[PDB]
């Protein structure tokens, strides 16, 4: 309970957004980070009507974040387990989720900020940032299982980080996780072998990564638009895959192609992805990336 924090040190400000079985609030936390009086944070909660299965998932996300320390992974700050409601305190991602952010950039977007769509450059930055976060995850022997734009978060400075570890699993023992029973799965982002055998690996995460790239270059368009889940299932399981979005830079088109190889061992690794983009990145990258870290031995 080294992460436990007094419910008194927490103060909820407003509501940031509704989650599928909980509410995410913005708030203040006193003495949660040594050297800081109060820190603005995000606070995840569970609805009273939330099922056990959902509570376990909620507790799983917290549990796995405890072992993470990466600039490109949303950071866990503390937990309040003593008496309900339970609170998961993490770093505040000022610009919310990437999907929502990407849609704001659509010209027609009612909430369009005041800038054009991301630049090839800006996209490569996001891509490397996301890939770096995933590489750390993989290095720690965890498979995310739910990589998607809605689960990528944007910092006040627009740095993208990996978030939402509800479906994340420890694969230290076998390098893969196999789900046998029924369950809610993010089908449109799933690799073929996962849809068929329920097997998840860093390779299936890579497929999801390809789908995120597509999300980025299509400004969060809904993947496999038109098809229904069952159709998607069949489509992908039979060798299918998304089309290139409009004007999609070919370099990114190349990544997607590598991400969607039918055979998981044909797809690239997150480290390889970063290595392929290391040169064309913001100068600060080497100072924060997991890639250029001593940990990456």
């Amino acid at each position: 309970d080294e992460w436990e924090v007094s419910r008194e040190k927490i103060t909820l400000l407003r509501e940031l957004g509704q989650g599928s079985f909980g509410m995410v609030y913005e708030g203040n936390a006193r003495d949660i980070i040594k050297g800081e009086a109060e820190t603005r944070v995000a606070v995840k909660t569970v609805n009273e009507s939330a099922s056990l299965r959902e509570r376990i998932e909620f507790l799983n996300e917290a549990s796995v974040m405890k072992g993470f320390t990466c600039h490109h992974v949303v950071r866990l700050l503390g937990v309040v387990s003593k008496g309900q409601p339970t609170l998961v305190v993490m770093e505040l991602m000022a610009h919310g989720d990437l999907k929502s952010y990407l849609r704001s950039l659509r010209p027609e977007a009612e909430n369009n900020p005041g800038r054009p769509p991301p630049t090839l450059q800006e996209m490569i930055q996001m891509a490397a940032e996301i890939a770096d976060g995933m590489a750390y995850l993989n290095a720690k022997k965890f498979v995310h299982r739910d990589l998607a734009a809605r689960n990528c978060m944007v910092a006040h400075d627009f740095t993208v980080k990996i978030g939402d570890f509800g479906m994340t699993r420890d694969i230290y023992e076998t390098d893969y996780y196999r789900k046998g029973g029924k369950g809610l799965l993010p089908v449109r982002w799933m690799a073929p072998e996962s849809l068929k055998d329920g097997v998840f690996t860093t390779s299936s995460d890579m497929w999801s990564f390809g789908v995120v790239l597509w999300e980025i270059t299509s400004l969060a368009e809904q993947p496999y638009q038109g098809l229904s889940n069952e159709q998607v299932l069949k489509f992908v399981m039979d060798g299918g895959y998304l089309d290139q979005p409009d004007n999609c830079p070919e370099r990114v088109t190349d990544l997607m192609r590598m991400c969607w190889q039918f055979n998981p061992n044909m797809r690239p690794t997150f480290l390889e992805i970063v290595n392929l983009l290391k040169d064309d990145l913001h100068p600060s990258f080497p100072e924060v990336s997991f890639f250029h870290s001593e940990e990456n031995k």
Partner: peptide, 14 residues
Amino acid sequence: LPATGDFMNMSPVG
């Protein structure tokens, strides 16, 4: 608000 539709209740195929 949450993308509940992105998930499908299912079990592996074969």
